Ligand binder design. Structure first.
Ligand code: 017
Ligand code: CL
Ligand code: CL
Ligand code: CL
Ligand code: NA
Lengths: 99, 99
């Protein structure tokens, strides 16, 4: 797919059998999703965005489908205002920016 | 170009006569630049992201040169940790996300 940017680049993701909406975000290093349950252990992480730092739960090697493409990697869970797919998983689905 | 996402997609921009580095950010609705002076009128705005909100100055009809391509639109100025080129200007340079 070729996604233009006149609207937010929102896609359907599937994580834990659940469909969610997420933003494809080239300005995010990491993928951050709103509070949900994920399996296994987590490790702490602080991430810094526009407004300041937040604490998140880091889950590694999580299976996630993004716009129909399978990825397996790190998912951060915390109080983000929107689910964002960051570069760690955009690279796994082969995404590039083009102009 | 085609920009891969293994690393942050940073580019050189020219704005208000100044060269700056900025992140090409599909997750940003609007372009946000670190504190600088710009000509003309402005109005206050609050914009929110992970960590919460910051107060910015909204300037309209600002020209920016992005990676050699000129674009005009709104630029927000304030205490952002990173300069970001958001969708409002990415569209004008014909940027797309492809996978
Ligand atoms: C959270 C998104 C919905 C919105 N953001 C754009 C986003 O790309 C930011 C842009 C960004 C980048 C660095 C620092 C602050 C903000 N990235 C970000 O917060 O990423 C976090 C998750 O991975 C990490 O890597 C980068 C920081 C972490 S935002 O910077 O808060 C923002 C909000 C509104 C406008 N107009 C412009 C930008
Ligand atoms: Cl990962
Ligand atoms: Cl604009
Ligand atoms: Cl177009
Ligand atoms: Na103006």
């Amino acid at each position: 797919p070729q996604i233009t940017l006149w609207k937010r680049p929102l896609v359907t993701i599937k994580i834990g059998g659940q469909l969610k909406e997420a933003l494809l975000d080239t300005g995010a290093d990491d993928t951050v999703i709103e509070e949900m349950s994920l399996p296994g252990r987590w490790k702490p992480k602080m991430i810094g965005g526009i407004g300041g730092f937040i604490k998140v739960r880091q889950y590694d090697q999580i299976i996630i489908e993004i716009a129909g493409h399978k990825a397996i990697g790190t998912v951060l869970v915390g109080p983000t205002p929107v689910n964002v797919i960051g570069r760690n998983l955009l690279t796994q689905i082969g995404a590039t920016l083009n102009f």
